[PDB]
Design a protein around this nucleic acid. Sequence first.
RNA 1: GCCU
Length: 73
Amino acid sequence: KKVIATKVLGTVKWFNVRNGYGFINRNDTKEDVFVHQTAIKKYLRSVGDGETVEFDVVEGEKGAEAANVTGPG
RNA sequence: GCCU
């Protein structure tokens, strides 16, 4: 998957642990980006609604998606 | 695994 942007900050809109995905609102563009549980760095791979996260934006098979999702430090 |  092609990297489109790196070191992007965003706010978690919601993340559903039953379905394994959610959306992050990018702080730089105000657009939502899909996030799958497997894209979150070390339950073990989850983020919380309302938290600020840092991530890359990549081109998945269905459009842009988050990758390498971590805390901002 | 694209609005729960």
